[PDB]
């Protein structure tokens, strides 16, 4: 009972179909780089301006008012899941995302909620999605999302960010059983959560495995990959059993060059790439079946509009017009110029058409 | 006029020669994980217990008293070069390495010293090297080192660590000229510095390009690679002109999977790898000429001694007995157990011999 989709270029490319042009969207398009974002966000604290459907909806719609993006992604935070599981967050302006009381001992798992009840705790997200889907009025598709099991585990154990993930990785080596247990709890919670996002109106899903790079091939296939595979499999199964049409799923493994091959067989229609992997080599690794979502160095936007167009042109030339969705290699940075984001979007549209005509 | 080298396994492997066993050493073997290291270091501040030849010598020798490592690396800090160039460091216990006044404008380059005078400012390092070479009495080779131009630039612009290198990378995109200028100043200072380390007695050299991963292939070949190439070329040339025998040079580019091919042709005898690159794929990328220095996940040492031996066995099996020097994928972490470091060393020696016999 939602508006009929007008521009579905993003969805067609995601499924591997040919399109008149290359669709484009930016991770964190609804971000601090937009003056309007800080003002709206300054209404209250993080988990209040995130808990308000209308607020999340507005934040989601803001970038679309500035740029002809080919998709919108619901505004939320990957930390909503750990929170919904019973972990307290103290979002401060300086540090940012933080768990003042991180998991450290296997015993610390007892304080988490039964993953089965997490979906009911995230009702506000579902409401924001339905609302955003209604307000978008079929302009472009709406992407739902969540953090991958390993990445969420790193936040829960590290308590926040880290350049080494030493505490989280220590868990994998010293506490492999407890690590598997935590990773399973995270999977059992993400599935019903992601399914709920589709039920509420999400037309695609992206799983962010942002801390994939801290692991090597062996650990990754051992503790991260299995759950990345379980999420896609189970989400697809529940959607079919519920009578709903599965949506295209994207797996983003930042710094995951070493796992591109495994990921292309993980059950996701799209594989997101960071800027360190050359497009052509990525294509080799993933094959010719999956769609690659892709990688301009976000910092590249610091260059002039002219330089951006050229860098975009070269990026498209490497990826080729088939099975490709343009994007940045990572989320946008707070000090980036909105006008340069516009140039990126425009450049992708202009060149992708030339690369076809 | 130094003692004759008794065990040269490290040097032979570095040059590509066959050895009875695989030589092994650890980045940061002289590190906080050793109780004796903190005590000696607690004599005074960082740049005082580093400015004392006898102190640096003792720190260098400490790990060798515990483990039969096949090489020793002079104890120092990559930040000594920027400091010697005129930048003030305020080493605090919490943050660590820091420049309270980082370079931000092109004008900020004017306060740096003429790179030609940097060598004379680092005399204390040379003294510590000669002293350590004398005291080692030819037991094993002594490795000298420095940070690569880009990596040093990131510290000078960022003022310290960063998970994105946004300020440094902004320089590359917005200030490519000034970036090239700074990178050249850093090259012109490193060459005479590295040559001086050999003159003082260093029998090998390692260039740490620790922040290689923040750049992508394009930027890397554009701003990092050229200087990595200049260092090796110029150091070799000056050593020959001085009548000295060039030493084997190692290039370590952490998270530099994308540049393994270029690096193997950069003029270095050895290419250091981080733990994310599979040994076999690294071998493919580098070829069959260069020696690979290599990669156990430092965090792997959190596992039991038994598990470490197995992980070491598998690592050796992948690298093969030819052209290989065992090491960790990165420096040791402060909370690691000395006994587990011993097990790593022992495992490499035991298995490498079995892999031959």
Short mmCIF file of N, CA and C in Angstrom, two decimals, chain B residues 239-349:
data_model
loop_
_atom_site.label_atom_id
_atom_site.label_comp_id
_atom_site.label_asym_id
_atom_site.label_seq_id
_atom_site.Cartn_x
_atom_site.Cartn_y
_atom_site.Cartn_z
N UNK B 239 76.05 5.04 -0.53
CA UNK B 239 76.83 4.00 0.14
C UNK B 239 77.97 3.49 -0.75
N UNK B 240 77.70 3.35 -2.04
CA UNK B 240 78.71 2.88 -2.98
C UNK B 240 79.79 3.94 -3.16
N UNK B 241 79.35 5.19 -3.34
CA UNK B 241 80.27 6.31 -3.51
C UNK B 241 81.14 6.51 -2.28
N UNK B 242 80.64 6.09 -1.12
CA UNK B 242 81.38 6.23 0.12
C UNK B 242 82.30 5.03 0.34
N UNK B 243 82.29 4.10 -0.61
CA UNK B 243 83.11 2.91 -0.51
C UNK B 243 82.52 1.82 0.35
N UNK B 244 81.32 2.04 0.89
CA UNK B 244 80.67 1.04 1.73
C UNK B 244 79.82 0.06 0.93
N UNK B 245 79.59 -1.12 1.48
CA UNK B 245 78.78 -2.13 0.83
C UNK B 245 77.30 -1.90 1.13
N UNK B 246 76.47 -1.73 0.09
CA UNK B 246 75.05 -1.51 0.36
C UNK B 246 74.49 -2.62 1.23
N UNK B 247 73.44 -2.30 1.98
CA UNK B 247 72.83 -3.28 2.86
C UNK B 247 71.46 -3.66 2.31
N UNK B 248 70.93 -4.82 2.72
CA UNK B 248 69.61 -5.18 2.20
C UNK B 248 68.54 -4.25 2.81
N UNK B 249 67.71 -3.68 1.94
CA UNK B 249 66.64 -2.77 2.34
C UNK B 249 65.23 -3.37 2.25
N UNK B 250 64.45 -3.18 3.32
CA UNK B 250 63.09 -3.69 3.45
C UNK B 250 62.06 -2.56 3.38
N UNK B 251 61.01 -2.76 2.60
CA UNK B 251 59.94 -1.78 2.50
C UNK B 251 58.71 -2.41 3.11
N UNK B 252 58.20 -1.79 4.17
CA UNK B 252 57.00 -2.27 4.85
C UNK B 252 55.85 -1.31 4.60
N UNK B 253 54.85 -1.74 3.85
CA UNK B 253 53.69 -0.90 3.58
C UNK B 253 52.47 -1.57 4.19
N UNK B 254 52.15 -1.19 5.42
CA UNK B 254 51.01 -1.76 6.12
C UNK B 254 49.73 -1.42 5.35
N UNK B 255 48.88 -2.44 5.18
CA UNK B 255 47.62 -2.33 4.43
C UNK B 255 47.90 -1.93 2.98
N UNK B 256 49.07 -2.31 2.47
CA UNK B 256 49.43 -1.96 1.11
C UNK B 256 49.29 -3.06 0.08
N UNK B 257 48.30 -3.93 0.27
CA UNK B 257 48.01 -5.05 -0.64
C UNK B 257 47.96 -4.62 -2.10
N UNK B 258 47.33 -3.47 -2.33
CA UNK B 258 47.15 -2.90 -3.66
C UNK B 258 48.42 -2.47 -4.36
N UNK B 259 49.51 -2.38 -3.61
CA UNK B 259 50.77 -1.92 -4.19
C UNK B 259 51.90 -2.94 -4.17
N UNK B 260 51.60 -4.18 -3.79
CA UNK B 260 52.63 -5.22 -3.72
C UNK B 260 53.42 -5.38 -5.01
N UNK B 261 52.75 -5.22 -6.14
CA UNK B 261 53.40 -5.36 -7.43
C UNK B 261 54.40 -4.24 -7.69
N UNK B 262 53.99 -3.00 -7.43
CA UNK B 262 54.85 -1.84 -7.63
C UNK B 262 56.04 -1.86 -6.67
N UNK B 263 55.76 -2.26 -5.43
CA UNK B 263 56.77 -2.32 -4.38
C UNK B 263 57.87 -3.33 -4.66
N UNK B 264 57.52 -4.44 -5.32
CA UNK B 264 58.50 -5.47 -5.65
C UNK B 264 59.48 -4.99 -6.73
N UNK B 265 59.21 -3.82 -7.31
CA UNK B 265 60.06 -3.25 -8.34
C UNK B 265 60.56 -1.89 -7.89
N UNK B 266 60.38 -1.60 -6.61
CA UNK B 266 60.77 -0.32 -6.03
C UNK B 266 62.23 -0.22 -5.63
N UNK B 267 62.97 -1.32 -5.76
CA UNK B 267 64.39 -1.29 -5.44
C UNK B 267 64.75 -1.75 -4.04
N UNK B 268 63.89 -2.57 -3.44
CA UNK B 268 64.11 -3.11 -2.10
C UNK B 268 64.25 -4.62 -2.22
N UNK B 269 65.17 -5.18 -1.44
CA UNK B 269 65.43 -6.62 -1.43
C UNK B 269 64.30 -7.39 -0.77
N UNK B 270 63.65 -6.75 0.20
CA UNK B 270 62.57 -7.36 0.95
C UNK B 270 61.31 -6.50 0.95
N UNK B 271 60.16 -7.17 0.98
CA UNK B 271 58.87 -6.50 1.01
C UNK B 271 58.12 -7.07 2.21
N UNK B 272 57.87 -6.21 3.19
CA UNK B 272 57.17 -6.63 4.39
C UNK B 272 55.68 -6.65 4.17
N UNK B 273 55.02 -7.66 4.72
CA UNK B 273 53.59 -7.80 4.54
C UNK B 273 52.84 -7.75 5.86
N UNK B 274 51.60 -7.25 5.80
CA UNK B 274 50.75 -7.21 6.98
C UNK B 274 50.00 -8.54 6.95
N UNK B 275 49.25 -8.83 8.01
CA UNK B 275 48.54 -10.10 8.11
C UNK B 275 47.29 -10.28 7.24
N UNK B 276 46.83 -9.23 6.57
CA UNK B 276 45.63 -9.35 5.75
C UNK B 276 45.85 -9.97 4.37
N UNK B 277 47.09 -9.92 3.88
CA UNK B 277 47.44 -10.49 2.59
C UNK B 277 47.82 -11.95 2.78
N UNK B 278 47.18 -12.84 2.02
CA UNK B 278 47.49 -14.27 2.09
C UNK B 278 48.89 -14.41 1.49
N UNK B 279 49.79 -15.18 2.15
CA UNK B 279 51.17 -15.40 1.69
C UNK B 279 51.28 -15.75 0.21
N UNK B 280 50.50 -16.74 -0.21
CA UNK B 280 50.51 -17.19 -1.60
C UNK B 280 50.15 -16.09 -2.59
N UNK B 281 49.11 -15.31 -2.30
CA UNK B 281 48.72 -14.22 -3.20
C UNK B 281 49.80 -13.14 -3.22
N UNK B 282 50.44 -12.93 -2.08
CA UNK B 282 51.51 -11.95 -1.96
C UNK B 282 52.64 -12.39 -2.88
N UNK B 283 52.95 -13.69 -2.84
CA UNK B 283 54.01 -14.26 -3.67
C UNK B 283 53.70 -14.03 -5.14
N UNK B 284 52.43 -14.21 -5.51
CA UNK B 284 52.00 -13.99 -6.88
C UNK B 284 52.31 -12.55 -7.24
N UNK B 285 51.77 -11.62 -6.45
CA UNK B 285 51.95 -10.19 -6.70
C UNK B 285 53.38 -9.70 -6.78
N UNK B 286 54.22 -10.16 -5.86
CA UNK B 286 55.61 -9.72 -5.82
C UNK B 286 56.51 -10.40 -6.83
N UNK B 287 56.18 -11.64 -7.19
CA UNK B 287 56.99 -12.36 -8.15
C UNK B 287 57.83 -13.43 -7.50
N UNK B 288 59.00 -13.69 -8.08
CA UNK B 288 59.89 -14.72 -7.57
C UNK B 288 61.30 -14.21 -7.29
N UNK B 289 61.50 -12.91 -7.47
CA UNK B 289 62.79 -12.28 -7.24
C UNK B 289 63.00 -11.80 -5.80
N UNK B 290 62.11 -10.93 -5.32
CA UNK B 290 62.22 -10.37 -3.97
C UNK B 290 61.94 -11.32 -2.82
N UNK B 291 62.39 -10.93 -1.63
CA UNK B 291 62.16 -11.73 -0.44
C UNK B 291 60.96 -11.13 0.29
N UNK B 292 60.10 -11.99 0.82
CA UNK B 292 58.94 -11.51 1.54
C UNK B 292 59.23 -11.64 3.01
N UNK B 293 58.96 -10.58 3.76
CA UNK B 293 59.14 -10.61 5.22
C UNK B 293 57.78 -10.82 5.79
N UNK B 294 57.64 -11.81 6.68
CA UNK B 294 56.25 -12.08 7.03
C UNK B 294 55.33 -12.49 8.18
N UNK B 295 54.26 -11.78 7.87
CA UNK B 295 52.97 -11.56 8.46
C UNK B 295 52.06 -12.20 9.50
N UNK B 296 52.53 -12.87 10.54
CA UNK B 296 51.56 -13.44 11.47
C UNK B 296 50.77 -12.31 12.14
N UNK B 297 49.46 -12.49 12.29
CA UNK B 297 48.62 -11.49 12.95
C UNK B 297 49.21 -11.35 14.36
N UNK B 298 49.69 -10.16 14.72
CA UNK B 298 50.27 -10.00 16.06
C UNK B 298 49.33 -10.48 17.16
N UNK B 299 48.03 -10.25 16.97
CA UNK B 299 47.02 -10.68 17.93
C UNK B 299 46.93 -12.19 18.05
N UNK B 300 47.51 -12.89 17.08
CA UNK B 300 47.51 -14.34 17.09
C UNK B 300 48.26 -14.84 18.32
N UNK B 301 49.13 -13.99 18.85
CA UNK B 301 49.90 -14.34 20.04
C UNK B 301 49.05 -14.41 21.30
N UNK B 302 47.76 -14.09 21.18
CA UNK B 302 46.85 -14.14 22.33
C UNK B 302 46.39 -15.57 22.51
N UNK B 303 46.55 -16.37 21.45
CA UNK B 303 46.18 -17.78 21.50
C UNK B 303 47.20 -18.53 22.35
N UNK B 304 46.93 -19.79 22.67
CA UNK B 304 47.85 -20.60 23.48
C UNK B 304 49.13 -20.88 22.70
N UNK B 305 50.17 -21.29 23.42
CA UNK B 305 51.44 -21.59 22.77
C UNK B 305 51.24 -22.67 21.71
N UNK B 306 50.38 -23.63 22.03
CA UNK B 306 50.07 -24.73 21.12
C UNK B 306 49.42 -24.20 19.84
N UNK B 307 48.44 -23.31 19.99
CA UNK B 307 47.75 -22.74 18.84
C UNK B 307 48.67 -21.89 17.98
N UNK B 308 49.62 -21.22 18.62
CA UNK B 308 50.59 -20.38 17.93
C UNK B 308 51.49 -21.24 17.04
N UNK B 309 51.97 -22.36 17.59
CA UNK B 309 52.82 -23.24 16.82
C UNK B 309 52.14 -23.69 15.54
N UNK B 310 50.86 -24.05 15.65
CA UNK B 310 50.07 -24.50 14.51
C UNK B 310 49.86 -23.39 13.49
N UNK B 311 49.52 -22.20 13.98
CA UNK B 311 49.32 -21.06 13.09
C UNK B 311 50.64 -20.73 12.40
N UNK B 312 51.76 -20.90 13.11
CA UNK B 312 53.08 -20.63 12.52
C UNK B 312 53.40 -21.66 11.44
N UNK B 313 53.08 -22.92 11.73
CA UNK B 313 53.31 -24.03 10.81
C UNK B 313 52.58 -23.76 9.49
N UNK B 314 51.31 -23.37 9.59
CA UNK B 314 50.50 -23.08 8.42
C UNK B 314 51.07 -21.88 7.65
N UNK B 315 51.55 -20.88 8.38
CA UNK B 315 52.11 -19.68 7.75
C UNK B 315 53.36 -20.01 6.93
N UNK B 316 54.25 -20.81 7.51
CA UNK B 316 55.46 -21.26 6.82
C UNK B 316 55.13 -22.10 5.59
N UNK B 317 54.15 -23.00 5.72
CA UNK B 317 53.72 -23.85 4.61
C UNK B 317 53.27 -23.01 3.42
N UNK B 318 52.64 -21.87 3.69
CA UNK B 318 52.17 -21.00 2.62
C UNK B 318 53.26 -20.19 1.97
N UNK B 319 54.20 -19.71 2.77
CA UNK B 319 55.30 -18.91 2.25
C UNK B 319 56.34 -19.73 1.50
N UNK B 320 56.58 -20.95 1.97
CA UNK B 320 57.58 -21.81 1.36
C UNK B 320 58.96 -21.47 1.91
N UNK B 321 59.89 -22.44 1.95
CA UNK B 321 61.25 -22.22 2.47
C UNK B 321 62.14 -21.21 1.74
N UNK B 322 61.77 -20.83 0.53
CA UNK B 322 62.58 -19.89 -0.26
C UNK B 322 62.21 -18.42 -0.07
N UNK B 323 63.21 -17.55 -0.19
CA UNK B 323 63.04 -16.10 -0.09
C UNK B 323 62.04 -15.62 0.96
N UNK B 324 62.25 -16.01 2.22
CA UNK B 324 61.33 -15.63 3.27
C UNK B 324 61.96 -15.38 4.64
N UNK B 325 61.52 -14.30 5.27
CA UNK B 325 61.96 -13.93 6.61
C UNK B 325 60.68 -13.83 7.43
N UNK B 326 60.57 -14.65 8.47
CA UNK B 326 59.39 -14.63 9.33
C UNK B 326 59.39 -13.37 10.19
N UNK B 327 58.20 -12.89 10.51
CA UNK B 327 58.00 -11.71 11.35
C UNK B 327 56.50 -11.64 11.59
N UNK B 328 56.05 -10.61 12.30
CA UNK B 328 54.64 -10.45 12.55
C UNK B 328 54.10 -9.54 11.45
N UNK B 329 52.77 -9.44 11.38
CA UNK B 329 52.14 -8.58 10.38
C UNK B 329 52.25 -7.11 10.75
N UNK B 330 52.57 -6.86 12.03
CA UNK B 330 52.75 -5.52 12.58
C UNK B 330 53.48 -5.62 13.91
N UNK B 331 53.81 -4.48 14.50
CA UNK B 331 54.52 -4.48 15.77
C UNK B 331 53.75 -5.15 16.88
N UNK B 332 54.47 -5.64 17.88
CA UNK B 332 53.87 -6.29 19.04
C UNK B 332 53.04 -5.31 19.86
N UNK B 333 52.00 -5.83 20.52
CA UNK B 333 51.13 -5.01 21.36
C UNK B 333 51.61 -5.10 22.82
N UNK B 334 51.54 -3.98 23.57
CA UNK B 334 51.94 -3.83 24.97
C UNK B 334 51.45 -4.86 25.98
N UNK B 335 50.28 -5.44 25.74
CA UNK B 335 49.72 -6.42 26.67
C UNK B 335 50.02 -7.87 26.32
N UNK B 336 50.91 -8.09 25.36
CA UNK B 336 51.25 -9.44 24.97
C UNK B 336 52.22 -10.11 25.92
N UNK B 337 52.04 -11.42 26.05
CA UNK B 337 52.83 -12.26 26.94
C UNK B 337 54.18 -12.63 26.32
N UNK B 338 55.30 -12.25 26.98
CA UNK B 338 56.66 -12.54 26.50
C UNK B 338 56.83 -14.02 26.17
N UNK B 339 56.20 -14.88 26.96
CA UNK B 339 56.27 -16.32 26.77
C UNK B 339 55.66 -16.77 25.45
N UNK B 340 54.66 -16.03 24.98
CA UNK B 340 54.00 -16.34 23.71
C UNK B 340 54.87 -15.86 22.54
N UNK B 341 55.67 -14.82 22.78
CA UNK B 341 56.58 -14.30 21.77
C UNK B 341 57.69 -15.33 21.60
N UNK B 342 58.06 -15.96 22.71
CA UNK B 342 59.09 -16.98 22.68
C UNK B 342 58.63 -18.15 21.85
N UNK B 343 57.38 -18.56 22.09
CA UNK B 343 56.76 -19.67 21.37
C UNK B 343 56.72 -19.41 19.86
N UNK B 344 56.44 -18.17 19.47
CA UNK B 344 56.40 -17.79 18.06
C UNK B 344 57.78 -18.02 17.45
N UNK B 345 58.80 -17.46 18.09
CA UNK B 345 60.17 -17.58 17.63
C UNK B 345 60.58 -19.04 17.51
N UNK B 346 60.33 -19.80 18.56
CA UNK B 346 60.66 -21.22 18.61
C UNK B 346 59.95 -21.99 17.51
N UNK B 347 58.67 -21.69 17.31
CA UNK B 347 57.86 -22.37 16.30
C UNK B 347 58.41 -22.17 14.89
N UNK B 348 58.83 -20.94 14.59
CA UNK B 348 59.38 -20.64 13.26
C UNK B 348 60.65 -21.45 13.00
N UNK B 349 61.51 -21.54 14.01
CA UNK B 349 62.76 -22.28 13.91
C UNK B 349 62.52 -23.77 13.75
#
